[PDB]
Design a protein around this nucleic acid. Structure first.
Ligand SMILES: [K+]
Ligand SMILES: [K+]
Ligand SMILES: [K+]
Ligand SMILES: [K+]
Ligand SMILES: [K+]
Ligand SMILES: [K+]
Ligand SMILES: [K+]
Ligand SMILES: [K+]
Ligand SMILES: [K+]
Ligand SMILES: [K+]
Ligand SMILES: [K+]
Ligand SMILES: [K+]
Ligand SMILES: [Mg+2]
Ligand SMILES: [Mg+2]
Ligand SMILES: [Mg+2]
Ligand SMILES: [Mg+2]
Ligand SMILES: [Mg+2]
Ligand SMILES: [Mg+2]
Ligand SMILES: [Mg+2]
Ligand SMILES: [Mg+2]
Ligand SMILES: [Mg+2]
Ligand SMILES: [Mg+2]
Ligand SMILES: [Mg+2]
Ligand SMILES: [Mg+2]
Ligand SMILES: [Mg+2]
Ligand SMILES: [Mg+2]
Ligand SMILES: [Mg+2]
Ligand SMILES: [Mg+2]
Ligand SMILES: [Mg+2]
Ligand SMILES: [Mg+2]
Ligand SMILES: [Mg+2]
Ligand SMILES: [Mg+2]
Ligand SMILES: [Mg+2]
Ligand SMILES: [Mg+2]
Ligand SMILES: [Mg+2]
Ligand SMILES: [Mg+2]
Ligand SMILES: [Mg+2]
Ligand SMILES: [Mg+2]
Ligand SMILES: [Mg+2]
Ligand SMILES: [Mg+2]
Ligand SMILES: [Mg+2]
Ligand SMILES: [Mg+2]
Ligand SMILES: [Mg+2]
Ligand SMILES: [Mg+2]
Ligand SMILES: [Mg+2]
Ligand SMILES: [Mg+2]
Ligand SMILES: [Mg+2]
Ligand SMILES: [Mg+2]
Ligand SMILES: [Mg+2]
Ligand SMILES: [Mg+2]
Lengths: 140, 166, 95, 107, 41, 97, 148, 80, 191
RNA sequence: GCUAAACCUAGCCCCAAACCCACUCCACCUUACUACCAGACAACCUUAGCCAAACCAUUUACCCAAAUAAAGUAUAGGCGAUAGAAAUUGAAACCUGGCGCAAUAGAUAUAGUACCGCAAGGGAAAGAUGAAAAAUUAUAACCAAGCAUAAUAUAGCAAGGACUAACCCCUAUACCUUCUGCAUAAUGAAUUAACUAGAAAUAACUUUGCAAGGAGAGCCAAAGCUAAGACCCCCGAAACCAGACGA
RNA sequence: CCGAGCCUGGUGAUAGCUGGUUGUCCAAGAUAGAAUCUUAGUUCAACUUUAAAUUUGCCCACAGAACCCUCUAAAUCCCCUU
RNA sequence: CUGAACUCCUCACACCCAAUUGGACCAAUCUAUCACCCUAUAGAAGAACUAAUGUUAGUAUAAGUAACAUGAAAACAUUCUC
RNA sequence: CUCUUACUUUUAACCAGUGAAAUUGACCUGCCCGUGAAGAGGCGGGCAUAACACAGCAAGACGAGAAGACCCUAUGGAGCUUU
C-alpha cells in the first residue's frame, strides 16, 4: 500500500493566511513565511508584558503632567494619597486628569494638605496632636 | 493555456430601460504568440494606455521598436471590428482602456560556451491584450494642489482622539 | 553474536561461554578464578585457597551471559547424581 | 495576531439592557441524523434537553431537521442579522448543552 | 508532463476550392478522391 | 496545484457478494470437523508461505531452499544478494546488542 | 539515536566486546562444567505425592500393572527422549502419606521409595528402555502408523 | 492522480466559497429560505419582548397594502 | 488476518536496472556527491523501506480461545433475541420470494444465516431459495464462524445442529492436554 | 489576465497454473546480412577479492534436491570472530487471484529506441476533449512559484504592541546544523511542485485463555504455559578482486 | 584529471568521519571514574528514565576518629532528637 | 518615587531545559462493517519534510545585461572599393 | 624610464534586432565610537537621512569560484625501497 499526502494544500494555507499582510516573498512562499509567522506569534505572546508596562508608564507621565499644573510632583501625590487611605490607581487618576479636572485638583489639594501636615509633625516632638487629614481609620 | 480574453466580446447585456443612461461599448482584442519580449512590449502598451485610438496610432507609427508595428496592426483591426460588429458609430470615439502584455509559450535551445560548457537560451514569445471603450479619453487627474494638502492635513489633526483612555 | 543465522534463521550460542561458565536454573552463573593454576610457588596458601573456589557472577555479567546463550542452556535438567543439583533452586529468598 | 485581524469597539445592540433586556438569539437550526455515530450526542440532546431548553427560551424558534448527514451542525441567527454556524460532530450531550447556552447568551 | 506548444493562427489566405487545389499542386500535396457509400442526407 | 479540481467517481461497494458473504466460513474446520483438517491448509498462495510467518531474512532464506531450484537466474542472483545484505544488517548493524 | 559516534551510525561493536581489554568471558579459565552434557542420562522424577494424587483422581488405576505408558497416557509425566531422557526415577517425596498397593515399573528408584511401596503390599521393579524403545513406549500410536 | 475523496470534497467546498465571494448572490427574504414557520416566528416576537400581543391583531400589523395589491395580481394571471 | 498474504513488493536500489556507475567524480564538479543514479534520493531510484512481499500474516489463537468465541457469539445472539431455532429447513416451495416474505413477517432482519448439519442432507427446497438470494445464505454446521455471525443480523439453527455444537464446544472444557494430534487414533475420540 | 493547473488510462509488480522450444521467397562467420572452387585452427583446468575479526597474517554463512522437529545440539575454530550436521521424525497441496502501483509510481521501456562512447558499454524524456469532430467560432470559471492589472517617499531580520490613521511612536541581534560558547564575517539553503530516511531477536512489561500442568506430536514447567501487542534510518569515499573492451 | 587505463560485475564494498533524518501536546531529565594500538570511539561503573516491592532516607546532639610533625586552617566523617 | 514572567489581587491551570526517556492525541490512505455533502468503531501500512553543495521538472535573480551580425550606390540589371 | 602626449582602429556608450553564465536564506541593504565566537549595514550610545535612473571606481560585503593541495587526525588508502 502506497500512501501519499492528499491534503497538503490546506496544511500550508493555515500558515499563509497569517502572512497575507507581510511584505515580499514571505507572504506567498511557505518556506519563507513559516519562519516569519512563527516570529510574529512569539512577539505577540511576549508583547503582553510590554503592554502592561507601557500603560503604567503612560499613566504616570500623564499624572506627572497634571500634578505640575498645581505645583506638585508625582511622588508627593501618590505617596500622600496613600497616607489618606485613598486607594486610587494610576489608570483612574490619569482618566480623572483628562475628563474630571475639577476632581483632580481636589485630590492634589488633599495631597498638598497631608504633605504639609507631615512637615508640621516633623517639627514637633509628639506633643502636638496629629493633623485632621493625618488620622487613620482602623478596621478590626 | 487560457483564452478568456476572447470570450468577453460574447457577453450580451440585457436591454436597457428608457431612463437608464447610454452604456459605452467595450471591445476586447488580442494577438497571441508574438516573437517579442513581454518586458520590451510592456513599454509600448504602457505608452498608449489611456490614449485615444487616433493618438495611439500616431505614436506607434513613428516608433522604431518592432512591437510598435505589431500593436498598430492589432489596434487597426480592433477599430474596424468595433464599428462592424459591436455597433460603434464613430471610429475615432475610442480610447485605450487597458493595454498590457503577457508571457507566451516559449521554446528552449542550447547556447554553446567555452571549455565544453553550455547555456540554455529560450526563444521568447508574448501576447498583447487591448480593450477599447467608446467615448473620449477620461480627463487626466490634475496634480494635487496646496489647498488639498492643507485640507488633508487639517483633517488628520481633527480626526485624532485621546488614545489609551476612556 | 549471530542474531539470525543464514541457514536456519535463528539465534546462535557463543561456545566460549559454555566452556567456562555453568548456569543454575535459578539464573546464577558459576565460574573459576583467573589464575588458579599460574605461579603457585609465589602465592600463599590463603590466596591459593580462594583461587580454587567456585564463585558466582553479578547481575550485569549474568545478563550478558544469558544473551550469549540460547534457551537450550536454560532448561531444567535432571542429571543423575549431579554435584550441583541442590544449587538449582533458591530457598528463603525475599525481594 | 491583532495586526493580522480586524477590531471593533465594545458595543451593544440597540442599547440593550438600558430600558429592558432582549435576548438576541432569534433562531436555532439543528441538523441531526437518524443513523450515524457522529450524531449520537445530538440525538440524545433532542430527547431530553431541547424540549426543556425551549421552555426557558420562548423567544427562540428551534428547528430540528433530521436528515442524512455525516457532520451535524447547529446554526444560530441573531436579531442584528449575524449568523454563526457550528459543528456538534462527535460531542457529548453535556458539551452540546453548554454550547447551545453559550449561543443564547451571546449578542 | 502536460506540455503542448501551439503556434499562432495561420489564417489560410485562399478561400476558393480551385485555388486550394491549384496551390496544393504547387506544393506537391496530393489528395486522392474519397471512397464511401454513405452520403449526406 | 497537486490537488484535483473535480470529484472522483463514486466508490460503490457490494457488501453482500459471494466473497464477502462467505468470508470466514470453514475457519473452524478442525474444531467442528474432528480435526481432520487444519485451518492453515485453507491458505492459498506461495508454497513457501503457507501456514508460516517470518521476517524478510527468514522469508528469503525459506524461498531459496524451497523453490530456489526453479527460480530465474536473474531473480535468484538478486535473492542471494538480498540475503547477504540482510545478514549484515541484522547481525552487525543496529542500536541494541 | 544520540549524536554521532558508533551509537547513531549503527556501527557498535559486537556483544561482549569491552572496548579492547581482554573481555570478561575470555579472561576466565576453562573448566569442564558442561563437558559431555549431551551424553548424560536424565530421569524425570516421579514423587509418591504425585502418584497418589493420580490414583485418587482415577487417572492411573492401581488394579493393573503401572508402566511408563500408563503414566504418560494419564498426563502424570512428560518424557523427552530427544532430550537425553532415559525414563523416570521414583523419588521418596510423600512417602509418609503414601497409601496404595501398586505394581509400578520405574527406571530408577531410591531405597526409601521402594520401602513405601513394599510396606503397603505393592511391588516395584526397575527396567531399562533404550532411546528408541523409550519413544515407542511413551507414544505407541504414532509408532503403529509407521508400518514397522 | 492521487487516490482519496476527503481532500477533493474539501477542496470543492473552498471553491464554492471563493465563487460566492467573487460573485455574491442577490439577497432574498428570510421566509423563502428553509427553516421558517410564520406562526412560530411571530409568537416569539412578542415573548421575546415580554408583551402579551394579540395574534389576530399582530398578524395584520405586518400586512401592507402594496403586498395585498400584488398578491391579487398573481391570482389574476392564474385565474384564481 | 491469519490467512492474509500481501503480494505488494518494491525494488531496492540493488534491483533497479543500471545504477552501477558513479555519475560524476567525487570532487571538483561543484555538485553533490552521488555513487549511483538509482539511490532513493533520485527520480527512478530504489525504495528505501518499502514492501518486501510476498508477506504472510499467519498466526494461531489457542484452540480453547477460538472455541470460546463461538460460545459468546451464540450467547449474544440469544440475549439480543437474534437467535431462532428450527426443526427442519424444509420449505413448502423453492420460491426465494417466500423465504423473504417469511423473514419480514416475523421481523428477523435484513440478513439471515441458515445453518444446517451437513452439506449433503440439505433439502433442495431451501437450496433453491438461498442460491438466488444475497442476504439469505446457507452454510453447514461445520462452517460456522464468528465473522459470519456478526455480519448477519439473524442466526437460524436446526435442532440437530444445536446438539452438534454443544458436543464440540464442551469437549474443550473437559479434555486432557494433547499427547499427539487429535487426528490420530484416541481411546474415545471421535465419540 | 498570461504562464499554467487538473484527469485515467496505457501498461507494470507479486503469486498460481502450466515445462520450454520456428517457418513466404532471397541474403547473412569474407569488410555478417556479399549467388559459384583444393580444404584439414578447434571445446574442457581449484574463482578471487571487498567485507567481519573493530589492524591483519589461519579463518569469515552463500539454494544443491522433503516443510516441521531433533538443533543452533554433537562438532569445528588465531578454540577468537564466527561456522555448523546427522541418525531419527514426518505434513499439506481446488490456476484464472491481490487491505499491489496508477505516468517523478509501476518494468529502463511510447525503447534497449533517441542520444553519448573507437569499443565493451551506458541510457532517456513523454500521454489525457466528447456518445459523435462527417458536432473544432471547442471542453466555463475558481488554485504553486513567476509576472501583469498596480514602481517608489526618512528608520533599519521588516514584524508585533497598537492606533482615528498604511508609515511615523515604543519593543525586538533570521533559520538549521555544529559547538564550552554563533546575530556572528562558521555550515547549508534562489524559490514553487513532487520525490526523499528506524527494518528485528533475547528477556522483561501489559492484556486474554487454560492451569500443575500449558501448547493443534517436537518444547517448556519447583505457577507456569500459550497467543497477541510494543524497541534497533538515509546519502557519500579514495580503494581491492574477477572477467571483458581498447594502440 | 594513469604513482598506473576504461567498462561491467562482486556491490546497497567499507567508512569510530561530515552531512541529513518528515504530525500535535504534556512530563522527568547535565553525569566521580576505570580499562582500552586507547583518549574524534567503545565496555563497565556513576548520573539519568520507567514499572514494581519494601522501609527508612535527608537534615543532624553529646561522646568518639595519631603519633611523627611546618603553616597549632576553613572543614569533614560519625550522629539520636527535630 | 521608578523598577520583573518574584509576590498579592479577579478567573483559570497538564500548558517554558540539549541528548535520552515515559505518556496522552492525531492527518490522509487501504480493508472489514457502518455511514451516505464526508463520517464512526476497529484492523493494516511505501502512513506526514522551512534545510542532506539532496533528485526531476517549472519559473525567477544576475539581465533585457555580457555577447552575436550585413562592404557601397542603383534601374536589382549592374557597377564601384578592398 | 625622466614624464608623458597626440592620432587611427577595436572595445566603448546611445538607437534597433537577438539574447547567455557563475551567483542569490530573506532584506525596507548608512557613518563614528564602543560592545561581542575576540575585525558589525542589522546589538548599545550618538550623528546622518524625500524618492529615482545612467555612467565610473574597486576600500568593504572576512566578495564569487574549487567540502585547503600546507599542517594534524583516521587502528582510512595507495606508489616506491629494504638486512
Ligand atoms: K543487529
Ligand atoms: K582496515
Ligand atoms: K524511466
Ligand atoms: K546546516
Ligand atoms: K564563528
Ligand atoms: K568557512
Ligand atoms: K552565515
Ligand atoms: K561540520
Ligand atoms: K575514534
Ligand atoms: K603630443
Ligand atoms: K570592492
Ligand atoms: K572567498
Ligand atoms: Mg570543444
Ligand atoms: Mg548530526
Ligand atoms: Mg562523540
Ligand atoms: Mg547494482
Ligand atoms: Mg558507493
Ligand atoms: Mg522505480
Ligand atoms: Mg577487519
Ligand atoms: Mg589500515
Ligand atoms: Mg516510468
Ligand atoms: Mg500565483
Ligand atoms: Mg526602529
Ligand atoms: Mg570552536
Ligand atoms: Mg549572542
Ligand atoms: Mg567546518
Ligand atoms: Mg523494529
Ligand atoms: Mg587485501
Ligand atoms: Mg585484475
Ligand atoms: Mg597506429
Ligand atoms: Mg554506508
Ligand atoms: Mg520539565
Ligand atoms: Mg593492546
Ligand atoms: Mg541519622
Ligand atoms: Mg511593576
Ligand atoms: Mg510565579
Ligand atoms: Mg499553574
Ligand atoms: Mg477525524
Ligand atoms: Mg515515508
Ligand atoms: Mg515540499
Ligand atoms: Mg532540498
Ligand atoms: Mg550590470
Ligand atoms: Mg557590448
Ligand atoms: Mg541593446
Ligand atoms: Mg553560498
Ligand atoms: Mg567594531
Ligand atoms: Mg551603479
Ligand atoms: Mg551579512
Ligand atoms: Mg575539508
Ligand atoms: Mg583495508
Amino acid at each position: 500500500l502506497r500512501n501519499r499526502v492528499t491534503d497538503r494544500y490546506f496544511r500550508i494555507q493555515e500558515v499563509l493566511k497569517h502572512a497575507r499582510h507581510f511584505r515580499g516573498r514571505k507572504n506567498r512562499c511557505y518556506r519563507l513565511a513559516v519562519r516569519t509567522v512563527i516570529r510574529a506569534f512569539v512577539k505577540c505572546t511576549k508583547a503582553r508584558y510590554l503592554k502592561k508596562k507601557n500603560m503604567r508608564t503612560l499613566w504616570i507621565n500623564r499624572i506627572t503632567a497634571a500634578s505640575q499644573e498645581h505645583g506638585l510632583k508625582y511622588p508627593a501625590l501618590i505617596g500622600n494619597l496613600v497616607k489618606c487611605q485613598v486607594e486610587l490607581n494610576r489608570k483612574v487618576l490619569a482618566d480623572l486628569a483628562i475628563y474630571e479636572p475639577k476632581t483632580f485638583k481636589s485630590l492634589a489639594a488633599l495631597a498638598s494638605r497631608r504633605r504639609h501636615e507631615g512637615f508640621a509633625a516633623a517639627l514637633g516632638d509628639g506633643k502636638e496632636p496629629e493633623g485632621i487629614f493625618s488620622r487613620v481609620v482602623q478596621y478590626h | 493555456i487560457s483564452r478568456k480574453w476572447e470570450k468577453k466580446n460574447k457577453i450580451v447585456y440585457p436591454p436597457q430601460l428608457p431612463g437608464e443612461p447610454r452604456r459605452p461599448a467595450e471591445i476586447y482584442h488580442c494577438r497571441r504568440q508574438i516573437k517579442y519580449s513581454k518586458d520590451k512590449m510592456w513599454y509600448l502598451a504602457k505608452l498608449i494606455r489611456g490614449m485615444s485610438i487616433d493618438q495611439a496610432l500616431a505614436q506607434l507609427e513613428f516608433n522604431d521598436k518592432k512591437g510598435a508595428k505589431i500593436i498598430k496592426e492589432v489596434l487597426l483591426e480592433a477599430q474596424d471590428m468595433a464599428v462592424r460588429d459591436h455597433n460603434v458609430e464613430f471610429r475615432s470615439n475610442l480610447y485605450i482602456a487597458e493595454s498590457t502584455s503577457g508571457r507566451g509559450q516559449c521554446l528552449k535551445r542550447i547556447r554553446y560556451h567555452g571549455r565544453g560548457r553550455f547555456g540554455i537560451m529560450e526563444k521568447v514569445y508574448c501576447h498583447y491584450f487591448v480593450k477599447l471603450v467608446e467615448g473620449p479619453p477620461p480627463p487626466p487627474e490634475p496634480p494635487k494642489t496646496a489647498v488639498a494638502h492643507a485640507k488633508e492635513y487639517i483633517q488628520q489633526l481633527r480626526s485624532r482622539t485621546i488614545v489609551h483612555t476612556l | 553474536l549471530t542474531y539470525f543465522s543464514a541457514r536456519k534463521g535463528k539465534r546462535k550460542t557463543v561456545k566460549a561461554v559454555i566452556d567456562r561458565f555453568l548456569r543454575l536454573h535459578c539464573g546464577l552463573w558459576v565460574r573459576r578464578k583467573a589464575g588458579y593454576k599460574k605461579k603457585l610457588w609465589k602465592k600463599t596458601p590463603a590466596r591459593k585457597k580462594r583461587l580454587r573456589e567456585f564463585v558466582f557472577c553479578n547481575k550485569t555479567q549474568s545478563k550478558l551471559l544469558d544473551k550469549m546463550t540460547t534457551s537450550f542452556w536454560k532448561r531444567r535438567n535432571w542429571y543423575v547424581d549431579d554435584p550441583y543439583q541442590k544449587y538449582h533452586d533458591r530457598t528463603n529468598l525475599k525481594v | 495576531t491583532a495586526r493580522g485581524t480586524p477590531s471593533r469597539f465594545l458595543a451593544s445592540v440597540l442599547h440593550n439592557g438600558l430600558g429592558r433586556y432582549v435576548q438576541q438569539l432569534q433562531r436555532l437550526s439543528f441538523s441531526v441524523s437518524r443513523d450515524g455515530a457522529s450524531s449520537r450526542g445530538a440525538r440524545e440532546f433532542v430527547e431530553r434537553e431541547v424540549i426543556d431548553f425551549a421552555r426557558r427560551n420562548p423567544g427562540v424558534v428551534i428547528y430540528v431537521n433530521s436528515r442524512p448527514c455525516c457532520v451535524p451542525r447547529v446554526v444560530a441567527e441573531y436579531l442584528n442579522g449575524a449568523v454563526r454556524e457550528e459543528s456538534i460532530h462527535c460531542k457529548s450531550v453535556e458539551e452540546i448543552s453548554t454550547l447551545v447556552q453559550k449561543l443564547a447568551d451571546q449578542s | 508532463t502536460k506540455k503542448r506548444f501551439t503556434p499562432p493562427i495561420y489564417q489560410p489566405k485562399f478561400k476558393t476550392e480551385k485555388e486550394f487545389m491549384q496551390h496544393a499542386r504547387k506544393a506537391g500535396l496530393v489528395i486522392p478522391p474519397e471512397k464511401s457509400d454513405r452520403s449526406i442526407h | 496545484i497537486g490537488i484535483r479540481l473535480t470529484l472522483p467517481p463514486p466508490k460503490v461497494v457490494d457488501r453482500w457478494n459471494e466473497k464477502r458473504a462467505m468470508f470466514g466460513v470453514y475457519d473452524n474446520i478442525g474444531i467442528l470437523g474432528n480435526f481432520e483438517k487444519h485451518p492453515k491448509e485453507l491458505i492459498r498462495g506461495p508454497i513457501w508461505l503457507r501456514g508460516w510467518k517470518g521476517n524478510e531474512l527468514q522469508r528469503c532464506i525459506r524461498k531459496r531452499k524451497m523453490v530456489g531450484s526453479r527460480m530465474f537466474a536473474d531473480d535468484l542472483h538478486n535473492l542471494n544478494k538480498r540475503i547477504r545484505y540482510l545478514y549484515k544488517h541484522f547481525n552487525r548493524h543496529g542500536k541494541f546488542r | 539515536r544520540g549524536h554521532k559516534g558508533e551509537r547513531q551510525r549503527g556501527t557498535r561493536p559486537r556483544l561482549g566486546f569491552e572496548g579492547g581489554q581482554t573481555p570478561f568471558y575470555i579472561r576466565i579459565p576453562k573448566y569442564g562444567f558442561n563437558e559431555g552434557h549431551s551424553f548424560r542420562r536424565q530421569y524425570k522424577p516421579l514423587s509418591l505425592n504425585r502418584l497418589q494424587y493420580l490414583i485418587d483422581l482415577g487417572r492411573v488405576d492401581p488394579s493393573q500393572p503401572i508402566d511408563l505408558t500408563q503414566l504418560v497416557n494419564g498426563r502424570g509425566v512428560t518424557i523427552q527422549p530427544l532430550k537425553r531422557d532415559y525414563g523416570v526415577q521414583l523419588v521418596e517425596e510423600g512417602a509418609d502419606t503414601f497409601t496404595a498397593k501398586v505394581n509400578i515399573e520405574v527406571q530408577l528408584a531410591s531405597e526409601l521409595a521402594i520401602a513405601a511401596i513394599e510396606k503397603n503390599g505393592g511391588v516395584v521393579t526397575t527396567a531399562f528402555y533404550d532411546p528408541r524403545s523409550l519413544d515407542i513406549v511413551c507414544k505407541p500410536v504414532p509408532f503403529f502408523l509407521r508400518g514397522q | 492522480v492521487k487516490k482519496g475523496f476527503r481532500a477533493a470534497f474539501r477542496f470543492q467546498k473552498e471553491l464554492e466559497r471563493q465563487r460566492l465571494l467573487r460573485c455574491p448572490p442577490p439577497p432574498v427574504r428570510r421566509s423563502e429560505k428553509p427553516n421558517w414557520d410564520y406562526h412560530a416566528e411571530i409568537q416569539a416576537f412578542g415573548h421575546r419582548l415580554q408583551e402579551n400581543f394579540s395574534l389576530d391583531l399582530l398578524k395584520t400589523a405586518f400586512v401592507n397594502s402594496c403586498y395585498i395589491k400584488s398578491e391579487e395580481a398573481k391570482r389574476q394571471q392564474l385565474g384564481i | 488476518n491469519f490467512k492474509r498474504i500481501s503480494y505488494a513488493k518494491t525494488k531496492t536500489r540493488a534491483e533497479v536496472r543500471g545504477g552501477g556507475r558513479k555519475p560524476w567524480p567525487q570532487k571538483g564538479t561543484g555538485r553533490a556527491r552521488h555513487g549511483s543514479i538509482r539511490s532513493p534520493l533520485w527520480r527512478g531510484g530504489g525504495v528505501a523501506h518499502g514492501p518486501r512481499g510476498p508477506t504472510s500474516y499467519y498466526y494461531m489463537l489457542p484452540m480453547k480461545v477460538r472455541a470460546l468465541g463461538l460460545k459468546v457469539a451464540l450467547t449474544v445472539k440469544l440475549a439480543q433475541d437474534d437467535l431462532h431455532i428450527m426443526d427442519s429447513l424444509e420449505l413448502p416451495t423453492g420460491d426465494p420470494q417466500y423465504l423473504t416474505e417469511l423473514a419480514h413477517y416475523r421481523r428477523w432482519g435484513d440478513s439471515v444465516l441458515l445453518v444446517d448439519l451437513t452439506h449433503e442432507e440439505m433439502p433442495q427446497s431451501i437450496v433453491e431459495a438461498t442460491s438466488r438470494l444475497k442476504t439469505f445464505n446457507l452454510i453447514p454446521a461445520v462452517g460456522l464462524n464468528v465473522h459470519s455471525m456478526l455480519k448477519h443480523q439473524t442466526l437460524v439453527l436446526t435442532l440437530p445442529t444445536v446438539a452438534f455444537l454443544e458436543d464440540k464446544l464442551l469437549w474443550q472444557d473437559s479434555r486432557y492436554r494433547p499427547l499427539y494430534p487429535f487426528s490420530l487414533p484416541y481411546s474415545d475420540f471421535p465419540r
